[PDB]
Symmetry: C2
């Protein structure tokens, strides 16, 4: 509401090798028009996220972005990679596990059914930008020069509901400086997240 | 001078399956006796730790405790296990990686050269215990029923200086409720620990 913008954080997902939902063969700008059209044409439901500043829409996947999370099994565990990875240069690296794009669990995957489009308020985006401050430029729809909400993340998934965020994401959100949305840890949310992520991994690239 | 105690947190290291430095076939009291007898005989240097409430003593290893950390290489990385484990019952679980006791990296290891004996102030132990509500018994030397300093951790290691704590531990130290000692995160301390723990994993049990 009104139409959307794209926050500069999301721009990492249009670059091959992204650890999660890689959106291929389309520009961020072309990605934003299409999402915005969906909105104009279908008036989707704006869904509460984990805090007041965070919303979600779920849309059919109009991209060739593939399923990016797979269940970990006895059979496929041997393909887990591990390492200390940053989301971006400004952040400290975090202990992270994933299936590599080259591995058996990732060779099967096809286009995901939906897209979970994660939105931050204008205010929250500004708040974090006045702490870390990246001099990167957001991508605006020519139809909307001052959007109230920005796309910060895109999850390519077969569920049309919110999948829990990784437990380290939750832990980092405790530290705006490092940053960090700036929300206190809620034990119950953290433990829900852990129960999901004990048996799932992100697929790289 | 005074002599030391054992904080209840350190008791977990005398149980086989400990994730790190397992002290074998010796009671915590017999451990503390020998440590205090070394203090009286040898006047060891009390070395500052990461915070004012934390010190170390580095002692020749008088136990059969084995080297508990191994350099990760391209040929042993296949033996890494991953998972969400808690340090104790009241802690939330955290993403971890290790070499299992059975793995080829762990079959070669022998008695370590030194012990790093990590101390917390009486004050700090009190402060954390009153935030977490714990109910384990501290181990006291008959010779010192009111120590100024308590053994919280024992590292069985081959160098006579402080090895960086895991990144996890530094992040949890920002939350005393989780806890947590706790201390605002130092970017540069954190990054120093990442550069070590990139190439190193604990050996279990």
């Amino acid at each position: 509401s009104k139409l959307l913008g794209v926050n500069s954080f999301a721009l990492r997902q249009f670059v091959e090798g992204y650890r999660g939902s890689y959106i291929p063969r389309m520009s961020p700008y072309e990605f934003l028009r299409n999402v915005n059209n969906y909105i104009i044409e279908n008036n989707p439901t704006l869904v509460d996220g984990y805090a007041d500043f965070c919303k979600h829409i779920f849309i059919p996947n109009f991209t060739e972005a593939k399923q990016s999370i797979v269940k970990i099994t006895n059979e496929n565990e041997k393909y887990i990679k591990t390492g200390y990875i940053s989301r971006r240069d400004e952040e400290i690296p975090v202990l992270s596990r994933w299936f590599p794009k080259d591995s058996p669990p990732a060779s099967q995957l096809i286009k995901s059914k939906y897209l979970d489009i994660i939105l931050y308020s204008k205010e929250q985006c500004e708040k974090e930008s006045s702490i870390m401050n990246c001099c990167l430029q957001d991508i605006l729809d020519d139809r909307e020069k001052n959007p109230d909400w920005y796309i910060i993340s895109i999850k390519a998934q077969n569920e049309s509901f919110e999948v829990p965020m990784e437990p380290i994401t939750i832990l980092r959100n405790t530290l705006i400086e490092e940053g960090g949305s700036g929300v206190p840890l809620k034990r119950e949310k953290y433990l829900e997240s852990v129960e999901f992520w004990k048996e799932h991994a992100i697929v790289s690239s």
